[PDB]
Design a protein around this ligand. Structure first.
Ligand SMILES: [Zn+2]
Ligand SMILES: [Zn+2]
Ligand SMILES: [Zn+2]
Lengths: 478, 478, 478
């Protein structure tokens, strides 16, 4: 696994450093799915879905959703298997009116998107990734940009100005005042000008026009996210960790789609009856960090309408002549359905032993977290994790490679952030689980994670895809 | 100057990224001085100094001190011109007993050297630079190592565990407990072992033995400093800033020695009487961040004994036969002497307008700071800055390139950190000034500075070297 | 070692109980050095120093400094080895105007010298030690007194008067008001009078006149320190500890001079080339507890002028005819020089586990502390402790007795008191180390320490004296 765990983390470290925002997360995953032969269908034309074919759609370039229709569906004995991991992170997005000129320094005022460690974003060689809408002729042209060179810097305050050396000197980052990255000075802005809107920064507008090869006056408005220009890398002495940026479920949703790609490649190659019996959906949501209340979030009707469009297009012919309905067929498959929500989990911090549960601890290379909660912030029920642990045991009987797992639970007094596990499980009425891999410094600009956990997560989504209905057929209720 | 300012910042960005600590600061500057032909003399043999020759000495590989004896000294009309910038920074040095195994994670406990923004050191791909003493046979072998790959990581706490989203969530970095970088896990430490001292970390001892090509049992003890593995780079949209690490007077003492190298090259080439009339010393101190109370610090007798060894070796023949003394000759040259202390200064932060003086502000590309103080934490007197501003005007009359300057003064209510200006001016009884270039986020792991200020500082040390006695001859007291 | 460790602590317990102050510390050490044959030379006559002879000088009876000139000095290959431990402690010194008559009780108002546990000085049978200047005829006669009987008592407040039994009843010792020892009542002062200055206490003036055998009117002024009259003793069940008083480096500077005496006795007896090659200085400083800013402190020019007087008197003949200077010769020997600062260290307190570092702990009988620091309050560098640990290994190869050591480091958040390690290392420009032995209740009136650590310290100073140049010759720098 040492070789396959490093090869899995290598491709994840090719995915991140190209996935600088939520837009290039949808773009690079759609490019990753189209390399295996997925038919890229748009939401706006018409859906004529076929058996045995895989499909992919970016809903308005924020929400990736790739699904694979099995060969023999059975309305009677079949399932809809969904793996979920949001494609976004806590980033400093750029405000619309950004022209801050203070102390002879051109600045951007950025909006803090999500709930992040914003003091870690201080003193970083920052870049740009996101979506820029610009004019070309009479047509609005949309381009996803990726500026991997350092063009922004959020400077900290020098230590000499406040009181020093005690209780970490009472550092307080005011989110409006102190979080405003510098981009240029007014000296070299005017020096690089002689060789229309006053709301956009001309150092910024010169930068995007250099990337898009147009005038700065053609740049209309943009949704840009600040990213750290430092490439992700294997760390530790033994090159045993991974870290670069955005590992809050951009590493995790890589394993959602890498586990989904290996499933479809296992279905298409070497062609055993129940693998062609399911609808395997793999959706990368947006706007998780702010609560999923969006048109492309988890609380959206987007996924629920996607399944009701797959059911209507696949079973187009059997609605008419045996008088079934969509909600009859959808509620028929919901009993055999499942949701595998993948989002990162808190590894046991060695420097903070007071924020960890005693029994439910997570360590690196120890396996997938299975995140439980008091208040169902994670949707894991002890029945529905027992089915997934038996999919990990059916993986061990066939591939002779153990998928390790470990139960994670936050302390009863401390609160924890909710995920999209129970959001989609309420929208789709499907049972669910919340798994993920342990990482340290979650919601920060650099997040460290283990490379064996990337192997266990990719095989963990693949084992849930392959062996869920083999476990579900053996469950007898009263 | 645009071309020469970028070329000066380019070589500074070659100096830093090789100067990872205070030891490789002495090593790379001694290599930089020996490329121009400086005679590397050791403290332990004998000093036979000559006219017209330049010398360089690392005092126990921490304190660099390069000096140039002019061709015609005059005890009557001659000077000792000293430029000073310490070669060290706030870094996380490694403790001697470093074997921290908590939560199945191998850690280093590091000692916070200096007064730094230690919350900025969190979540950085950290490396190693410093001095390692190891055995080879029966001989203690000393080697200066530089590990530019990321082998350490100081992780932050995840945001979900404390209270969130208000007043920056009451972040408090306990300096002992929370500052302990992780280096490995106990899984891959034991996994990479089967394929003597219990105080040193075996993940660390495996790492240094891999660099030194010896056994881990030969590594005795080391003075290692954690550095950030990210290379320094030109930033801004117009590539107009510089930042990587350690810019608290490792950029500034580069300009001390780059201004010193250009002086000696101006003396040796194109061979006008008073340029050969002085002793130009350029010393890079250690241990400034902790108060210079050391054997290689500014409060040491090292510099005072160096001048009394230069005076004794140059004027070896005139002591005997006209019955002069060292203190007679040293106090004769102290009246014409000067100290140019170079250390970085606080640029006007746009996000913190309450910590800046109204009239004494520093902006980027606006010139050298001339740091004044109430309590003489900076040694600048208004007489002795008036001589240096006239050396900047004599530079403009010859080279037709203006050396811009700006006066810097901290507010009366806020305290500021003292420098080595008044420390060496008391030890040597020489008048002084405190100049430097404005930078933001001083004493942090990433410090941003302007590239025109690097040009003004290098020409500023060069103008003080070339034109001080031309200004000093025109001063008439009562 | 059990026999030699008890014999070493026995002579230390003869030294303390005669060393009641800083004056009798200089006196008894000068008597201890003169018993081995050290030539007692005064500062005021002339220095005609010889090879192979040992010298001793009390600078104005506060600062002891004994040195031994080796037989064959080599300016080329030779060294100055200095061991340092201050001879003073936190004591209640007597104020000049001491006539406090309150509530019919004669009192002394004492000045709190140093930073001590002054609540431990309450309720002690206190004595007197120090220097008394008195007249005899027309001549000012100076006498060092030692009153080992209890003549003073600093009483506490009874428990019934404040609130009781909770959180240690809010004890607050006001340093002026509550620290005033009673000495007599006005009843027995007047009763013992019938059988000039109003500023001195007549109960005190009767006491010193009884010791000096003169009138009370001849006593002019005095520098007296209150001491505890209880003799030091071996404690524990197994007689395994030592405690009496003043063990903050009066026990430690005993090991400085006992390690120095055993060196000189090893040089004179059994007469191998490099032992006669060095200048072994052993200096006992004063005024450490208040910051060494004194004429006899560590920040004084006393030690720096002593070495420049030894170099001038030993090399009196080679200055003239090969035209060397003092600062040339002094800076030649500084490269091979070292400073061994000895001051006590904090043993791991069992009742206070929150004030100790986790990895850098000190236990009794576990070895010498090697005190490291963040801010170089201790002058120990990891290079220069690596040389001293190899002097401890060269001791083990010759004497077959292991000198145990243990690294000590205070926590990063807590501050620690600075020592004279970096003070003398700045004044002399010599590299240094801070060693010492672990003790509990430092700066208190009773301080407990271990008897094996007294053996390790005496052999530790002796191993640094004997084997430093054997280690220093094997170091190869780049
Ligand atoms: Zn997430
Ligand atoms: Zn500095
Ligand atoms: Zn002490």
């Amino acid at each position: 696994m040492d070789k396959k765990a490093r090869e899995y983390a290598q491709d994840a470290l090719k995915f991140i450093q190209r996935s600088g925002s939520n837009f290039l997360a949808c773009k690079n995953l759609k490019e990753r799915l189209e390399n295996n032969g997925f038919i890229n269908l748009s939401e706006g034309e018409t859906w004529n879905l076929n058996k045995n074919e895989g499909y992919v759609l970016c809903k308005e370039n924020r929400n990736i959703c790739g699904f694979f229709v099995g060969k023999n569906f059975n309305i009677d004995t079949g399932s809809i298997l969904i793996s979920i991991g949001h494609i976004d992170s806590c980033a400093l997005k750029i405000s619309p009116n950004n022209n801050v000129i203070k102390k002879k320094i051109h600045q951007i005022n950025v909006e803090c998107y999500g709930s992040g460690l914003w003091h870690t974003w201080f003193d970083r060689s920052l870049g740009l990734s996101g979506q820029v809408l610009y004019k070309k002729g009479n047509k609005l042209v949309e381009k996803l940009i990726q500026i991997n060179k350092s063009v922004l810097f959020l400077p900290s305050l020098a230590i000499h100005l406040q009181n020093r050396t005690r209780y970490d000197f009472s550092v307080k980052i005011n989110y409006e005042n102190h979080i405003k990255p510098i981009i240029s000075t007014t000296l070299f802005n005017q020096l690089n000008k002689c060789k229309i809107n006053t709301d956009n920064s001309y150092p910024l507008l010169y930068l995007l026009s250099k990337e898009l090869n147009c005038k700065e006056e053609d740049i209309l408005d943009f949704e840009l996210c600040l990213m750290d220009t430092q490439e992700p890398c294997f760390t530790g002495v033994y090159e045993e960790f991974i870290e670069g940026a955005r590992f809050d479920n951009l590493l995790g949703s890589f394993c959602v789609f890498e586990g989904f790609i290996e499933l479809v490649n296992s279905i298409k190659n070497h062609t055993n009856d129940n693998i062609h019996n399911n609808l395997y959906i793999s959706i990368g949501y947006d706007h998780e960090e702010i609560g999923s209340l969006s048109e492309v979030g988890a609380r959206s009707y987007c996924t629920k309408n996607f399944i009701d469009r797959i059911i209507s297009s696949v079973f187009k012919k059997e609605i008419h002549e045996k008088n079934l309905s969509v909600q009859e067929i959808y509620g028929n498959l919901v009993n055999r359905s499942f949701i595998l929500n993948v989002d990162m989990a808190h590894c046991s911090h060695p420097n903070y032993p007071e924020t960890v549960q005693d029994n439910h601890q997570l360590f690196f290379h120890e396996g997938i977290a299975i995140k439980y909660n008091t208040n169902k912030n994670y949707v894991t029920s002890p029945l529905h994790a027992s089915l997934i642990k038996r999919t990990f045991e059916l993986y061990y009987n066939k591939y002779k490679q153990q998928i390790k797992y470990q139960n994670f639970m936050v302390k009863n007094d401390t609160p924890c952030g909710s995920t999209v596990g129970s959001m989609v499980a309420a929208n789709l009425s499907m049972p669910g689980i919340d798994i993920g891999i342990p990482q340290l410094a979650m919601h920060s600009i650099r997040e460290i994670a283990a490379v064996h956990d990337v192997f266990f997560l990719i095989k963990g989504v693949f084992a849930f895809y392959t062996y869920y209905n083999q476990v579900l057929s053996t469950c007898v209720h009263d």
